[PDB]
């Protein structure tokens, strides 16, 4: 019953490659990312208004 006691929280959001390259040093393994497969339509769990 308390948000403070929660062990973990998981959030899913939409991003582009420009956002990730905005901070190059923070992220790794950007070369192997399969961009086409992880489209918004290919993940039915995520809820969004993107056409």
């Amino acid at each position: 019953g308390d948000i403070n006691k929660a062990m973990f929280a998981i959030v899913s959001f939409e991003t582009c490659k420009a956002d990730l390259l905005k901070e190059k040093d923070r992220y790794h393994n950007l070369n192997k990312i399969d961009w086409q497969s992880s489209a918004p339509v290919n993940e039915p769990d995520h809820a969004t208004t993107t056409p």
Binding site: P44, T48, T49
Partner: protein
């Protein structure tokens, strides 16, 4: 198997079997021009999903 019946004089083209009889095949070579069709989405309001 949609083609005409193939005899033993097959020059080398591909073929298949229909009802125990050997027939030729057909291959598409399709060209899709702009604004020719649209997929129809049956949305649930509040989100876009399929």
């Amino acid at each position: 198997g949609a083609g005409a019946q193939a005899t033993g004089a097959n020059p080398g083209y591909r073929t298949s079997m229909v009802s125990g009889q050997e027939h030729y095949d057909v291959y598409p070579m399709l060209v899709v021009g702009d604004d020719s069709f649209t997929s129809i989405g049956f949305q649930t309001d509040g989100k876009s999903l399929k």
